[PDB]
Amino acid sequence: LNSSYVNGNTAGNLYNAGLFCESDGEVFFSNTNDNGRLYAMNIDGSNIHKLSNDTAMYINADKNYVYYVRNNNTFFSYDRNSLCRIKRNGHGSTVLDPDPCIYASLIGNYIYYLHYDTQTATSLYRIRIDGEEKKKIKNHYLFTCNTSDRYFYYNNPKNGQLYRYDTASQSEALFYDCNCYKPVVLDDTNVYYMDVNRDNAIVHVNINNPNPVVLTEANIEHYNVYGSLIFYQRGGDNPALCVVKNDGTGFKELAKGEFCNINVTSQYVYFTDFVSNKEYCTSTQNPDTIKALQP
């Protein structure tokens, strides 16, 4: 068992289908050139090799294992999915929860996830990393994608505010007064969210010295963050994947079209064309030229 509050993935990856997971110098990922199957590579895109024939999403990792949701037969609705585990070396594949689920997120020794009660009714579950102690935590789902140490953060379903759940005490409380969607808290001084009151424009704030800054135009669909750069999809009449620094500077349009599933690693930021399902990437530190993952 884990001895600290390890987090299975980073920033907004799990909101963006958890297609890439960087951990201790490797990246585990869903390979769009091979039916979304689980692969591994070194952080710079080399040494690419198949880990499992399972199609994988919501990929998480700790020092010993990779945890993932597989589709047994889109990432954000009901399908015949199962929660699984494999050793990082490729051995020891096993199923932890065979029942449909999405949004698996590792916090310490527990995976918190969305469980389907029916095709439309959902709840929050957790399970220990060895498959013991499966338990329904709430009758309504709370977002578990954004984690830091023992906490996960979410828009409160009743009131829209940014709340924090402490997995150690198994309690929750208000974290920041806003009306938010897919919040990404990196630390108490770096809060990001789509602001429901401003048509999902992205806002950045430090909760200690709150001076909320709006960083984008209205009508944002997806975003992610690495370092001080925010990568986002702008919708509407002239859709584009864009980047901007967290002080409003350095805006750049990176690709024209409708993209999604923005996943960040220290080397690259990956994104998929919503219609063609083709995948692309760009440098995380100096985003500019776009590489294609196909073939």
127 by DSSP, 3-state: which? Answer: strand
177 by DSSP, 3-state: which? Answer: coil
Task: Tell me if 284 sits within 8 A of 265, measured CB to CB.
Answer: yes
Spatial separation of the C-alpha atoms in residues 57 and 294, rounded to whole Å: 19
Report which of 53, 68, 61 is spatially closest to residue 17, judged by C-alpha positions: 68
Spatial separation of the C-alpha atoms in residues 100 and 290, rounded to whole Å: 35
Strands (E), 210-251: 213-214, 220-226, 229-234, 240-245
Q: Which residue has the tokens 């602001």?
A: 195
Q: Which residues are within 8 A (CB) of 166 and not within 5 positions of it... i.e. 6 or more apart?
A: 150, 151, 172, 173
Phi, psi (5° rounding) for residue 287? -60, 125
Q: Which residue has the tokens 């591994």?
A: 40
Task: Tell me if 222 sits within 8 A of 233, measured CB to CB.
Answer: yes
Q: Which residues are within 8 A (CB) of 102 and not within 5 positions of it... i.e. 6 or more apart?
A: 57, 58, 69, 75, 76, 81, 113, 114
Distance from the Cα of residue 253 to its chain's centroid: 22
Q: How far is CA 162 from CA 175, 206, 209, 239, in A?
A: 6, 13, 16, 28
Spatial separation of the C-alpha atoms in residues 242 and 201, rounded to whole Å: 13
Task: Tell me if 62 sits within 8 A of 8, measured CB to CB.
Answer: yes
Spatial separation of the C-alpha atoms in residues 122 and 72, rounded to whole Å: 19
Spatial separation of the C-alpha atoms in residues 27 and 215, rounded to whole Å: 29
Q: Which residue has the tokens 């945890």?
A: 67
Structure tokens at 243: 């980047």
32 by DSSP, 3-state: which? Answer: helix
Q: Give just the sign of the alpha carbon dihedral 47, 52, 54, 59.
A: negative
Name the experiment that determined this structure: X-ray
Structure tokens at 94: 């096993």
